Write a protein that binds this ligand. Structure first.
Ligand SMILES: *[C@@H]1O[C@H](CO)[C@@H](O[C@@H]2O[C@H](CO)[C@@H](O[C@@H]3O[C@H](CO[C@H]4O[C@H](CO)[C@@H](O)[C@H](O[C@H]5O[C@H](CO)[C@@H](O)[C@H](O)[C@@H]5O[C@H]5O[C@H](CO)[C@@H](O)[C@H](O)[C@@H]5O)[C@@H]4O)[C@@H](O)[C@H](O[C@H]4O[C@H](CO)[C@@H](O)[C@H](O)[C@@H]4O[C@H]4O[C@H](CO)[C@@H](O)[C@H](O)[C@@H]4O)[C@@H]3O)[C@H](O)[C@H]2NC(C)=O)[C@H](O)[C@H]1NC(C)=O
Ligand SMILES: Cc1cc(OCc2cc(C(=O)N3CC[C@]4(CCOC4)C3)[nH]n2)c(C(C)(C)C)cc1C#N
Ligand SMILES: [Ca+2]
Ligand SMILES: [Ca+2]
Ligand SMILES: [Cl-]
Ligand SMILES: [Cl-]
Ligand SMILES: [K+]
Ligand code: NA
Ligand SMILES: [Zn+2]
Length: 805
């Protein structure tokens, strides 16, 4: 109950709330059905529209008007945004030349440049080029400020997950807004776009920017605007708040437009009907900038123009129906559309089997436009699993398609020509970023980056300490003229041991054999130097990775590779090697096919054993440094050390062997050498973070050898590919992957074919950032380069997406 007969007299768009049953006048009252009786009359004035005309200039104030053209309006802070232009011979901001904003130029009493976040729904990245002729204000912000060619959203590429990621710096799995529809089984409660449960604060985790600011003494304008409040009124409200006295005035503001998304759903991303919504957004930007210029704030405020996601062509006829795959289709609940999430209709029904649902959805039709996954098997780059609100069964839907349960759901519910929500690597889902202001750089293009990074930057713009988040603070310092965050490398927690030769061959009873008794003083001193690290400059190009947790490990040097070997996990944490453009691929000779050799530097008790692998009928083994790339027949023996062995399912060995035999060499040829760091990952609880040993759910049968959930590789070369990877003077180029360690290749529908037809496609799907690997391993890479640490942070956040232009 709200007794709505109090008044909004003087309280219109009040910043601080008042608690029911007092009536409210803030821009959320509409949504609660709790506005005071006179809210529309007082707060939503519309009389005479939004623009001054010549006949209104110097009028007598009439408090009924939507905005004012009277002499006193500037000091009241409520002029129409074009007042100075119509009535005082001023230019619109868009007609003025770009002039570098070297320092903030602010009215007295401003303690810091305000931040205005101008968010646009569905604003696909290519609109910046394709709509350029009709968006002059946006194009000025873009060319004069700092911009990226695009900004990557989070998955799913829906509105609330992305807006709340913008506000928190968190992945959806962590902030808890995991889709536009949700069931939380702890609360036994559902979240929907329509209605009122979506306003309960227990849905929304982490710490959004307005809370961060408020806790640290910085005042915030509202971020949420009710749909009924017209755009012109949102802009006027921001401009009025900017005229408040110093102790009352917010420092951070947001605007939101439901366009161009609204129209894109109806007409597709490039429907002829889309020109008009783009024009109208630009006009709104023009209103804001003219308004700021009138208030002498246009060289004081930092403006961010940012989208939540793009928009793809999607029609009703491109719908896959689960009724064409499953016969039990009424025993499930599907969250449908551009992604799929499946759970049991009833938790009382113990007949429901996820394995058989997954199998009935796997590679069943020749051009099947969705792929089923257990959530823990989704590409780690999506970071879409560690939340009880994410159902175990997930369907990744091809761009341009939908999934639905039954045909009845599509025509008893064609309407739409656009949608979004797909994999965040998809070109059509990419969105925009421009930063314009004293704190941003002038006329500067920056590379594409992920929206999870912006929270830290907005905190930097406001002098705030960010709450813990998934950004990598410092990776976006290159956007900024000043306020840069000066990060430092994390301290190494565990130092390595450097073991020498300590064990005789006969102390090992590993059940391994090798055909290797083949007896020189030139080449005796030679091999000793290699085992003491003589080639380490060649194979370890960026320093050893730092171990950021407490553990016991050994550095092991070899002619062709260096490794950090874990005494706890009985395998390397990391293995590092460099393959030049000129390197030759060789075969594993017949006599060495099953060769495994004890490592006389590492005790029997801290070694793997061959008998376990023999006994484990499901599990085989591979090698981290590939025997195929040995520098010489004699060096090849090092590759068969028991300390280079890792557990691998035979199905996975098909993937790994093709990577190592064909792909590494291809990359070295294409990139002019590569440095490779490879290793295991253990993420049995799918939290994106390195497992402790007591979290491991699977071991090689009858042993303490833990089974990885994934294998990674980080492949680094010179960005200037005229220089070889091992003699690079300037910036680096990286691609990485985190491959799931699976006992079948069910994910790859073409896997019965030769590896040249499906392996590289799988590796692309599981593309990763170095930072993703860092989280999953507790390692810190690139510790010793000639590059600035901020540049290295940017490198560590890079994702190679394998989409065309
Ligand atoms: C991306 O960035 C984020 C942010 O930095 C990273 O997430 C953090 O990761 C930490 C490790 O996983 C995690 O720390 C744990 O927090 C527990 C207390 O947490 C509460 O308070 C914080 C702070 O205010 C709050 O933010 C949390 O909010 C979560 O939960 C509510 C729902 O209840 C949601 O509204 C919200 O969205 C958020 O959910 C997300 O995180 C939780 C985990 O907290 C997930 O379950 C959800 O799925 C969702 O993703 C909390 O309200 C604290 O109790 C933990 O301590 C245990 O573990 C330590 C090990 O050091 C042990 O020593 C302790 O004693 C304790 O163990 C005991 O409890 C165990 C669990 O019951 C029990 O099994 C044991 O036997 C012991 O008795 C722990 O410190 C931190 O909370 C989150 N923060 C957020 C915001 O998610 C994320 O990792 C980054 N991602 C990547 C890929 O890098
Ligand atoms: C900049 C910013 C804005 C923002 O919200 C702006 C907003 C969204 C809506 C709204 O009405 N929506 C959204 C979904 C929809 C549209 C079509 O139909 C469903 C209704 N209104 N205002 C938020 C949140 C976290 C408050 C959402 C965070 C940030 C940040 N950082
Ligand atoms: Ca949206
Ligand atoms: Ca984990
Ligand atoms: Cl959803
Ligand atoms: Cl708000
Ligand atoms: K085996
Ligand atoms: Na297959
Ligand atoms: Zn939409």
């Amino acid at each position: 109950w709200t007794a709505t007969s109090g008044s909004c007299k003087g309280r219109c768009f009040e910043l601080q709330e008042v608690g029911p049953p007092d009536c409210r006048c803030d821009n959320l009252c509409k949504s609660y059905s709790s506005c005071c009786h006179d809210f529309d009359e007082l707060c939503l004035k519309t009389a005479r529209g939004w623009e001054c005309t010549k006949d209104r200039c110097g009028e007598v104030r009439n408090e009924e008007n939507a905005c004012h053209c009277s002499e006193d309006c500037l000091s009241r802070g409520d002029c129409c945004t074009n007042y100075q232009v119509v009535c005082k011979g001023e230019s619109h901001w868009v007609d003025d030349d770009c002039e570098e904003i070297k320092v903030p130029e602010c009215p007295a009493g401003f303690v810091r440049p305000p931040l205005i976040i101008f968010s646009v729904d569905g604003f696909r990245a290519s609109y910046m080029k394709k709509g350029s002729k009709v968006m002059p204000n946006i194009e000025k912000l873009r060319s004069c400020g700092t911009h990226a060619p695009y900004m990557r959203p989070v998955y799913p590429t829906k509105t609330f997950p992305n807006l709340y990621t913008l506000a928190t710096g968190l992945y959806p799995e962590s902030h808890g807004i995991v889709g536009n529809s949700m069931y939380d089984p702890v609360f036994d409660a559902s979240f929907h776009l329509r209605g009122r449960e979506k306003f309960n604060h227990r849905w929304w985790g982490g710490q959004p920017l307005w809370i961060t600011a408020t806790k640290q003494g910085v005042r915030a304008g509202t971020f949420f605007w009710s749909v009924s409040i017209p755009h012109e009124r949102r802009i006027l409200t921001i401009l009025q708040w900017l005229s408040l006295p110093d102790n009352e005035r917010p420092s951070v503001y947001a605007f939101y437009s439901e366009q161009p998304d609204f129209s894109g759903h109806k007409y597709g991303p490039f429907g002829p009907e889309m020109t008009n919504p783009l024009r109208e957004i630009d006009k709104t930007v023009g209103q804001l900038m003219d308004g700021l210029k009138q208030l002498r704030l246009h060289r004081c405020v930092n403006v961010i123009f940012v989208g939540d996601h793009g928009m793809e062509d999607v029609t009703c006829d491109r719908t896959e129906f689960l009724s064409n795959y499953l016969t039990n289709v009424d025993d499930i609940t599907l969250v449908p559309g551009t992604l799929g999430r499946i759970r049991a209709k009833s938790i009382n029904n113990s007949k429901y089997d996820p394995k058989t649902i997954i199998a009935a959805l796997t590679c069943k039709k020749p051009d099947q436009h969705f792929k089923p996954y257990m959530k823990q098997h989704l590409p780690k780059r999506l970071h879409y699993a560690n939340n009880r609100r994410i159902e175990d069964i997930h369907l990744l839907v091809d761009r341009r398609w939908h999934v639905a349960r039954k045909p009845l759901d599509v025509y008893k519910k064609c309407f739409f020509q656009g949608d979004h929500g797909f994999d965040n690597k998809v070109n059509s889902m990419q969105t925009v970023f421009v930063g314009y202001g004293p704190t941003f750089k002038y006329r500067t293009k920056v590379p594409p980056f992920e929206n999870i990074e912006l929270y830290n930057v907005m905190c930097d713009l406001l002098g705030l300490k960010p709450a813990p988040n998934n950004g990598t603070h410092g990776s976006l310092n290159h956007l900024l003229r000043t306020n840069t965050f000066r990060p430092t490398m994390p301290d190494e927690v565990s130092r390595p041991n450097y073991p020498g030769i300590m064990y005789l061959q006969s102390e090992f009873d590993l059940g391994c054999t090798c055909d290797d008794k083949v007896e020189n003083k030139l080449e005796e001193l030679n091999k000793r130097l290699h085992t003491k690290g003589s080639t380490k400059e060649r194979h370890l190009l960026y320093g050893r990775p730092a171990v950021l947790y407490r553990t016991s490990y050994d550095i092991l040097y070899h002619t062709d590779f260096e490794s950090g070997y874990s005494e706890i996990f009985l395998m390397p944490l990391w293995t590092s090697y460099t393959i030049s453009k000129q390197a030759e691929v060789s075969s594993i000779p017949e006599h060495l096919t099953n060769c495994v050799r004890p490592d006389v530097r590492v005790s029997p008790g801290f070694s793997q054993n061959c008998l376990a692998y023999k006994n484990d009928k499901q599990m085989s083994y591979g090698f981290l440094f590939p025997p195929y790339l040995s520098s010489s027949p004699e060096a090849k023996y090092d590759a068969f050390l028991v300390t280079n062995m890792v557990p691998m399912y035979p199905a996975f060995k098909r993937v790994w062997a093709y990577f190592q035999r064909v792909l590494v060499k291809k990359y070295a040829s294409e990139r002019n050498g590569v440095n490779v760091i490879s290793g295991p990952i253990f993420d049995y609880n799918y939290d994106g973070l390195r497992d402790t040993e007591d979290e491991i759910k699977q071991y090689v049968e009858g042993s303490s050898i833990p089974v990885p959930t994934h294998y990674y590789s980080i492949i680094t070369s010179c960005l200037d590919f005229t220089q070889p990877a091992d003699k690079c003077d300037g910036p680096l180029s990286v691609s990485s992957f985190i491959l799931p360690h699976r006992p079948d290749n069910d994910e790859s529908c073409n896997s019965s074919e030769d590896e040249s037809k499906w392996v590289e496609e799988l590796m692309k799907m599981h593309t990763a950032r170095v930072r993703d690997i860092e989280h999953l391993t507790g390692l810190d890479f690139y510790r010793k380069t000639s590059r600035s640490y901020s540049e290295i942070l940017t490198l560590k956040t890079y994702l190679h997406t394998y989409e065309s232009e």
